[PDB]
Amino acid sequence: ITGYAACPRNWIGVGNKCFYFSEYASNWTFSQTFCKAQEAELARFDTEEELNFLSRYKGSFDYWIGLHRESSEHPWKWTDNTQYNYSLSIRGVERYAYLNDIGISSARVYADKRWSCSRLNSGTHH
């Protein structure tokens, strides 16, 4: 690592990331607009430590995450257009991913769910 630095207020630090969690349900598009306005993205995990933390901290509520696909015949990608590494199953035939009770599932864009944002920890510098 480069250094240790606290995530900003209302954000939670796990590994080299800072997570944010809403307590308000809205649609995937509104959620991604919000995340981008925080200089962040809909939540992305790159390690088991990070996925396990999201899956525990969410409690009993569904949370939107940053995986989506243009159709059921297109590849899953992150909101930055990085392709998904297909390391976990995703349930369903819909375009927008969320964490449920069991793991990752898919929903229509206009479903109302709480959301999480992530960003790499910048060490307060960017």
Ligand X SMILES: *[C@@H]1O[C@H](CO)[C@@H](O)[C@H](O)[C@H]1NC(C)=O
Give burial (CB, 10 Å; 0-12/13-18/19+) of 90: middle
Give CA torsion, residues 86, 90, 94, 97, to 10 deg. -90
Q: Which of 114, 116, 95 is nearest to 40 (CA)?
A: 116
- What gap in Å lies between CA 34 and CA 8, rounded to an integer? 17
Minimum Å gap between C-beta 93 and its own copies is 31
Specify the residue, 23 or 48, whose C-beta has the smaller distance to ligand X: 23
* Binding partner of residue 88 among ligand X, its own copies, none, CB cut-off 5 to 8 Å per kind: none
Q: Write the interaction track for ligand X spanning residues 14-53; mark x where CB under 6 A is met and - where it is not.
A: ------------xx-xx-----------------------
Residue 57 as a binder of ligand X (CB under 6 A): the answer is: no
Q: Which residues contact its own copies (rule: CB under 8 A)?
A: 1-7, 9-10, 12-16, 18, 49, 53, 56-57, 59, 120-123
